Point group: D2
Chain length 317, copies 4
């Protein structure tokens, strides 16, 4: 029998005997994603060029407004805003949302894939809502996932019940369930990082890459892929398996990607699909943050691939 995003969430909600507040949140976010998808594919661009005589800003406004108006949220952190946004009292609900409304949009000039990344927490302290409420470790996530605006638009939703993939059918504006309860390959054959920082790599990263190009067990070398847009690179890793790396360099001594709305959501999806995500020193989901725009190094993907890198890391003390 056919299933949609809304219907899947309502049945999981009735199964868990919840109040419906989370369903209202997710229904609002998906409405936002459909408007973002339509703008990213350039519907109406002809009016901007005079047929009748900014995208990361628009995306941020769409997500902010649909979440506020859902009556289900209280604190909102966005890549686009210097401080956390506190929802007004008459619209407050019980959830905290960290999001990147249009990740990769700096290179959208070349029509690279871009995406929306989100992670949802229950507000945990009873204090008055503040920026501190978004500083929970990723272990605390209630739901997280992403929308990828690639050759098609897909919504990946990870919850306690697992990971599920929904394809936007733009003819009816419905997210159709196409892949149920997905799991990542135990081991893949692709590695992904920006090798232009090879001069600054720590010795452990240098060796691990060398093992991928020149395998000691004369097996086939890995192929390399690096789009430069995290949502595209992570989703390929989920669908095909392998490993994705963004380690620290001289320009970025604490790493480059953001912990709250880039690293933690992707780590949650990976673990719910049976994968891994580490900083080298610890699991990403175990890092306790102190600043909402703080950075972290990340190595994630199929479990056999992340484990092999951790052994090389251990060799270099």
């Amino acid at each position: 029998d056919v299933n949609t995003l809304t219907r899947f969430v309502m049945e999981e909600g009735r199964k868990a005997r919840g109040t419906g507040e989370l369903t209202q949140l997710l229904n609002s976010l998906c409405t936002a994603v459909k408007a973002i998808s339509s703008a990213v594919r350039k519907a109406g661009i002809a009016h901007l060029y005079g047929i009748a005589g900014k995208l990361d800003v628009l995306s941020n406004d769409l997500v902010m407004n649909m979440l506020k108006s859902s009556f289900a949220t209280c604190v909102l952190v966005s890549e686009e805003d210097k401080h956390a946004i506190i929802v007004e009292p008459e619209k407050r609900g019980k959830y905290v949302v960290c999001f990147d409304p249009l990740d990769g949009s700096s290179n959208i000039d070349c029509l690279v894939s871009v995406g929306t990344i989100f992670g949802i927490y229950r507000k945990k302290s009873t204090d008055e809502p503040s920026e501190k409420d978004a500083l929970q470790p990723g272990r605390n996530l209630v739901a997280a996932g992403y929308a990828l605006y690639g050759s098609a638009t897909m919504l990946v939703l990870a919850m306690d019940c697992g990971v599920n993939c929904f394809m936007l059918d733009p003819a009816i504006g419905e997210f159709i369930l196409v892949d149920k309860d997905v799991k990542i390959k135990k081991k893949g054959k692709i590695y992904s990082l920006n090798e232009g920082y090879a001069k600054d790599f720590d010795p452990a990263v240098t060796e691990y890459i060398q093992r991928k190009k020149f395998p000691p067990d004369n097996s086939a070398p890995y192929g390399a892929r690096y789009v430069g847009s995290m949502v595209a690179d992570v989703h390929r890793t989920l669908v095909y398996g392998g490993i994705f790396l963004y380690p620290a360099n001289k320009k970025s001594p604490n790493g480059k990607l953001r912990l709250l709305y880039e690293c933690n959501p992707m780590a949650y999806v990976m673990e719910k699909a049976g994968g891994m995500a580490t900083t080298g020193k610890e699991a990403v989901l175990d890092v306790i943050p102190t600043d909402i725009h703080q950075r972290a190094p990340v190595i994630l993907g199929s479990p056999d691939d992340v484990l092999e890198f951790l052994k090389v890391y251990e060799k270099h003390s």
Copy 2:
């Protein structure tokens, strides 16, 4: 004034005082591109999953059927067909079209960007149409380009007048002109190739890539990008500058990419934009082919970068 692809081609055609066959061909090609785009974005997928109780094949059928019914073609070469297709006599016109209807479609499960690549020639003899009519050197091209089905759908068209970029507005089905007479940066800061196969690199490729990462002076090392879909990587090279390599090695003395409907159309776009495209031994556009599916190595992008690669390449000759 706002401009569309159909309006622009009509103006160039009336300017050159042509008969209109080339305009009919390009109009039919664009109807195919819009139908491919609609299917690539998964319109109507809900009916496939039972709401009421092939993509590379379909792309090929769309381009093939729209070209045959244009009355403007006589020989059609496609990546999908072993032999050249000869249009039935009642529908023959004067142009030869070589095309890849859905390049990158092998990895379409991960929603990577995909594309359609085409190059259009004038039939040169009055003999009866045969496969030989497609064996012209790239220098002979009348028009070439690609459609990128990325975060948005864009059509890039190169002719004698230069390179122009058109954005598909899906709300009305029109290609809107957004970048006129584009030129590539004289020197860039990005190199693009599959470094996972470094074990097999030609020694000149090894040394050249090492100089991008480890500059002998004190300039900044280049960044790395590799989507793995030719249309996406080539379009980024056009927009941002730099270099793209799919070179020859000892295991593949002729490269991997196909000359007729991958290498030549892209070489043509680059040269019309003030860039370069070499095999290492000569310009891609000067190769005279002997087989419709023959392969060729290609190194293309900003001219200062391509010239610097040839200096290292010649050092190892």
Copy 3:
């Protein structure tokens, strides 16, 4: 703040403390309405004419509505204009609601691109017996929600429940029904009457007089305008938006009318009453007729209350 159909129905459901079964039903029906809309607007018709080198629209609409309702797990008996007998939902998918619907009303003239629509009425099963066709034989008084989708110049969903009538506009760029008209009410009296005057030779004597009063008013005031699309959902929706009267009455050749009581007359009667209008057969209220056959017919006269009352006065004068 913006509001959508799903968001609006979730709030009324949370407010009334329901289990969610009705919300799943309506959300499933709304998905079916978007797929019908997409097909009615001829998306993909290029493929039927050979661009790369199937079913009738009323069959496909029936298949879409039937399939989404079954898969909602919210229904047990389904009556459709297209099926001779009531459909009894299999046990593993049964819920507590009975739905009577016309999946594509007016579709016989869809060759001229006239407006077409989907009509629906939803009941709660009343007996504890095993579900059967009898469960669909309730009077209109018992309806829980009813409405229609009009596939016109735009696609709109009109939903009537106890809280009133609300109008939602389909935004095809994102596939959402956007709330655009809240708590709608019909004018007390209008300026348009709607019926097929081509069959006047067979008119009841009372229908002849009332129409005569509309064209040639005894107090030489201004005549009414006449409009008749011939598609019930379009004529009834115009009656709601502009006011006036719609007639499909009984005569000597057809003493019971022509329109179907369960899935045409009753749902339109319910919408009208919730918006402050009237709907009669001439002898009794549409919503009070007790049916004996799921495909039985009934005459209908509906619209603005002053207009329907003036008709009843003429009908009674002719005994």
Copy 4:
């Protein structure tokens, strides 16, 4: 073989050895019609109702701007404009267009069908464009037709070669040919007019309608249909046969519909499909206009029905 509007017009135009100005015109008009359809079906209305925090006017702006920028027109007459619009000198071409950009839009609150009506003339002087260029009789039309925004969107185009019907496929923004060289039924079973104004009827209109309800030859009476949107009522008459009336009476001796951009294009379509269109006294296409906004009565449809009406009309002298 599949055919589209732009491909069909180019083929007829090359067949006639024309310069391409009319094709550039009709292609530009077809871009405006697709933009009007998109707005009429309410695409993007969510942004109007605040998701991120006029229609007849937009239609006139779309048609005016696409026609001006086509370089194919010099004078434009619109239902929305008091005086003719004169195209500025650098954009002038040789054609005159009379149009109603959104007919029936006064009742768009109830979502009744609406449409666009157009008629195209070659201009008259070689001097300078002026209003007089739009004052030609319907016999002079080069092409005319309408777009119906009903349950689907259809463009009906009549030229010298006949009447052809194109269905807009919104998934690709292309007009598909679906009914070729259409001809009307010789006699129908439906009459169409506003009977609420019967108190004002001409005696012949009264007698003719009486014959439809109470036939003297005891045959079956006709049915009645009246949408109130001329494009919808006229299109039903073409597809099903019958008669459509908006006749003269004492209060409106010249009718209500507009001659230049409502009566003439529909009269042309009817005659090209083998039907008739009269004022009662003469053929609509033979009226010579003196004012761009002058009115005329119209009776059109199947020939046996119009002849039967004229017989009653002639009996009353």
